[PDB]
Symmetry: C3
Subunit: 295 residues, 3 copies
């Protein structure tokens, strides 16, 4: 796109504030930002806030979100679809023109680990170019295993294709498949979907800890066979809903847009790979590392 | 196939009648019928009754089906495999020659949303050419959420490939992926697997209604990441068995031949897309629309 | 690989012995062995013990495994990752050099049907060349349906690609997709992943029996839509964990590395195909047969 030539918009922080016991304001941008998705490979991503996947959003069950999108793209319209919410897509997930803002309000009444993404036609194009992310809705009564958990992180799986190439998007295999981590607490890493960062700077944990991961596979196109090497998932909550409880799963099947909360114990010091077990995808980037130390 | 050149057999209604408290007769044809699968694109489908997917069958749990297939194909043998039933495949799912009929009897003792399809070798060929459909077996004691449901529809996902091309069938990506709807009550639409009809003539509902969809992904080859935009599934019953209860799912993973019953609430007026969230497939046709009005 | 030219190492039996109430010794090899994966097609597989998938391992819940790998490959390092176990991957799933042995110890504290495989980088290469298998961990308290089961078998799904071709492994469709069976009791068949053996020598059963299959889809890359023609799964335990109970499933979605225990009734004499319902894969080999007789 001629109007994207030379465009690299610096990342903008997510803006979020609570405005009542059950109401939260969220402000995001749609912007065009160079991301190093593999060593030496820059993708001029269509993004929320200059991150792909986008910034993490965390709300409580029963929060109404008053969402603003500021569209910094000089020429492409953008929008927002939160899977967490009940909304009219044709009224509430509508386009915001270049250099304009739009505000939309809707309730998140279901707990879980939900995909968000741009909903501008063609949606495949907007997702594949990078406009995806996760919103976590925390359950009013927790998870039955909350007391057992020592440490938590968020991981997101996505693919990258040939740049802005709709033929490849629809008919081609992914060039890269990648994990990223998004921060829940201060000092947690916050990364983009790339083939290397979580190998070179592993997630950290202590020997003996029960780890919770909030996970979502945003696609756009592939399913994920989520697995942590050297452990077994003690508990799995499909879509992060507490009712959808499985136990003792080696591998969690995630549809495209599918999420889960998974919990597992790391019993011994070492580095534990985290993979999609569809190994072609793993080979093309989708391996993260968890480094487990005696401290 | 030379003997299919110029052949376009007009659709024949499904014939069905109950013959006892636990016995039903079903009569279908195998026939060769031109279907417009995308605008301007005619596929000379191998079909049951001139529809692809085929006509909807609905029986009660515990019904024995006395099934007749009348094969109108001038040259290809056809057969029928109902996933709902317990049967000897080598006795009961056998070929019916051109211009002949065959009758087969077997029990449907399990509730759910089951695939049917031709079982003639090579089965990939017969399915990919259009010989698939759904049979619903209604549970003797219902679903625990029956009282909450205001409106119901059936949706079926399938793919289309290059015409009768076994290399493409086995090794190629789908050309189109599509939804169709099959009527449960008078006035419901009844459509074929195409890229457009359910966009141009959306399914209808009223603001505030809880909608049930009976869904199956007949493939032949892809899995489906079933999602309704702007809602969350309140309840999901895997394969339509009441025991396989999930709650609060954003997206339902369906294997090839996989079914579900899903329920969700439409809270606001508008048009709600229904997709497989594998967006390459969505782009290639697999988006239906639900239009929600104040009436 | 020049050092594999002309190499065909005869299969070596699995060595296994119990050494205490909760401890078992297992000795396997990594070796290079010609396998006929389709009629006329020899693949010089990288294997455990000259079988691909490898030999079946069965332990009890709570057994500690003292595992030895003897690496007979003249030039490639190999390793072992059991999904059943809690282990440090960077200490316990490490490489064994050509002509050396290594011993590793770790607990199997979770019941189920678990993948094992070589964990040597690039793991896609080692898995795709044949270094995969299943370990069954029997639950201390059984399955609630144990008393109903008349007969049991193990089935494993895997793919084969162009020989040792990492481009094909990562970017290509499978050449073949196959089932194999591995023996649980004397007289059970024990086969390799091929397109024909389980068609030509079907698994056997008696009319009216409830059959249990322990199943795993080892990939490397595809998911599986597991289905038995002419029946419905009465009970399904995801990953073989007794808690992950589904009922009345026509088809079981398995991620890559995913397992299950499935139970179904064969009501009538005949031959019952067993398929992945992703029919492109079925066409390329993934159909096994169960022959059901009045004896
Ligand atoms: Cu309150
Ligand atoms: Cu506000
Ligand atoms: Cu956009
Ligand atoms: Cu979406
Ligand atoms: Cu792909
Ligand atoms: Cu702890
Ligand atoms: Cu574990
Ligand atoms: Cu009766
Ligand atoms: Cu009759
Ligand atoms: Cu047919
Ligand atoms: Cu079938
Ligand atoms: Cu495909
Ligand atoms: Cu209502
Ligand atoms: Cu909803
Ligand atoms: Cu003991
Ligand atoms: Cu020992
Ligand atoms: Cu190896
Ligand atoms: Cu593994
Ligand atoms: Cu493939
Ligand atoms: Cu019995
Ligand atoms: Cu059955």
């Amino acid at each position: 796109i001629a109007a994207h030539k030379g465009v690299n918009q610096a990342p903008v922080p997510l803006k979020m504030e609570r405005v009542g016991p059950h109401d939260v304001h969220i402000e995001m941008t749609a912007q065009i930002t160079d991301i190093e998705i593999d060593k030496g490979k820059i993708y001029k991503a269509w993004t929320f806030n200059g991150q792909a996947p986008g910034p993490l959003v965390v709300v409580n069950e029963g929060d109404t979100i008053h969402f603003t999108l500021k569209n910094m793209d000089p020429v492409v319209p953008h929008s927002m679809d939160f899977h967490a919410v009940h909304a009219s897509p044709s009224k509430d997930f509508i386009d915001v023109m270049p250099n304009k803002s739009g505000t939309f309000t809707y309730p998140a009444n279901k707990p879980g680990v939900f995909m968000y993404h741009c909903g501008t036609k063609p949606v495949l194009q907007h997702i594949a170019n990078g406009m995806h992310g996760v919103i976590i809705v925390k359950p009013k009564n927790g998870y039955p295993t909350d007391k057992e958990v020592d440490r938590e992180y968020v991981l997101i799986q996505n693919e990258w294709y040939k740049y802005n190439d709709m033929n490849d998007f629809q008919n081609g295999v992914p060039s890269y498949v990648v994990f990223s981590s998004k921060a829940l607490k201060p000092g947690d890493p916050n990364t983009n979907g790339d083939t290397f960062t979580l190998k070179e700077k592993p997630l950290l944990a202590k020997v003996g800890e029960k780890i919770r991961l909030y996970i979502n596979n945003v696609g756009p196109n592939e399913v994920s066979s989520f697995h942590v090497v050297g452990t077994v998932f003690d508990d799995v909550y499909l879509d992060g809903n507490p009712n959808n409880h499985l136990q003792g799963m080696q591998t969690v099947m995630l549809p495209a847009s599918g999420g889960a909360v998974v919990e597992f114990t790391v019993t011994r010091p070492g580095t534990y790979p985290i993979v999609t077990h569809q190994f072609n995808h793993a080979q093309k980037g989708a391996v993260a590392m968890l480094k487990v130390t005696e401290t």
